[PDB]
Amino acid sequence: MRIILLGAPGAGKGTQAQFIMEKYGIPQISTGDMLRAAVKSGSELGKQAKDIMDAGKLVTDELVIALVKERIAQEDCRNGFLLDGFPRTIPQADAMKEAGINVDYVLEFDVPDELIVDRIVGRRVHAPSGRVYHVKFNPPKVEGKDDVTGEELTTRKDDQEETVRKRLVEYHQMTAPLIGYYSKEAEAGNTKYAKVDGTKPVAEVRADLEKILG
Ligand SMILES: Nc1ncnc2c1ncn2[C@@H]1O[C@H](COP(=O)(O)OP(=O)(O)NP(=O)(O)O)[C@@H](O)[C@H]1O
Numbered sequence: 001m002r003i004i005l006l007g008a009p010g011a012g013k014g015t016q017a018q019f020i021m022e023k024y025g026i027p028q029i030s031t032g033d034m035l036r037a038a039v040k041s042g043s044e045l046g047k048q049a050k051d052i053m054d055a056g057k058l059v060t061d062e063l064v065i066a067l068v069k070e071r072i073a074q075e076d077c078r079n080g081f082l083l084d085g086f087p088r089t090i091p092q093a094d095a096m097k098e099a100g101i102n103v104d105y106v107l108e109f110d111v112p113d114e115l116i117v118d119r120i121v122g123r124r125v126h127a128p129s130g131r132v133y134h135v136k137f138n139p140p141k142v143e144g145k146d147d148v149t150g151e152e153l154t155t156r157k158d159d160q161e162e163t164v165r166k167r168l169v170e171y172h173q174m175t176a177p178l179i180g181y182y183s184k185e186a187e188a189g190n191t192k193y194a195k196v197d198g199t200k201p202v203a204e205v206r207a208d209l210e211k212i213l214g
């Protein structure tokens with residue numbers, strides 16, 4: 001099945017993707033992960049995202065759209081996949097029709113705005129995997145270390161409170177209309193839609209999710 005995780009930054013998309021990927025076995029394809037890798041390794045494709053990411057602005061449609069298509073082909077998109085962070089704008093929405101990528105479920109995690117800052121400043125990730133944790137809301141079993149490999153956890157460059165305030169404006173201005181969008185694809189029959197409550201505890205959003213899924 002193909003799935004799109006739609007939501008505000010810090011709503012909990014990455015955290016649940018891990019579980020959907022482990023459980024269902026469909027690969028997890030996230031743009032922000034991709035882009036952060038391209039600029040670190042110095043990649044021709046995506047290495048330009050550096051500055052925009054840092055500013056908290058969204059990267060250009062035409063560059064994100066290429067990363068995706070390039071991934072959807074690399075021997076795994078057949079069991080289907082999970083879009084963790086895409087599409088982010090209507091034009092990004094549109095390229096998926098005009099390329100033929102359909103989907104089965106569109107999950108919107110709703111989480112109040114007043115909740116984002118503290119969820120992003122407590123964020124610690126394991127880049128070599130994408131595992132996220134929260135020093136306070138979902139700390140790792142051993143402090144400052146990943147559970148699976150014993151490795152050191154770091155923090156995203158764009159997880160400064162001022163930047164996330166920039167990130168919410170963009171999101172309200174460009175990504176939020178996608179809710180209405182897939183609400184429409186739903187009404188026509190091209191996919192299934194379901195709003196989940198991202199303020200519940202980690203173990204509680206997964207259940208709800210499994211409850212929608214199967
Ligand atoms: N259900 C939850 N309740 C409390 N804390 C959570 C919950 N879900 C995730 N978190 C934490 O909050 C931060 C945001 O969750 P994360 O899963 O990384 O979100 P994200 O939606 O993928 N954001 P972004 O990657 O910027 O688009 C991480 O620190 C998580 O540990």
Ligand SMILES: Nc1ncnc2c1ncn2[C@@H]1O[C@H](COP(=O)(O)O)[C@@H](O)[C@H]1O
Nearest residue numbers: 031032053056057058059064085086088
């Ligand atoms: N689909 C996208 N379109 C535009 N920018 C994106 C996109 N996906 C990720 N990025 C960039 O990555 C930054 C952080 O992504 P994320 O890891 O989803 O929170 C966002 O501020 C964007 O700059």
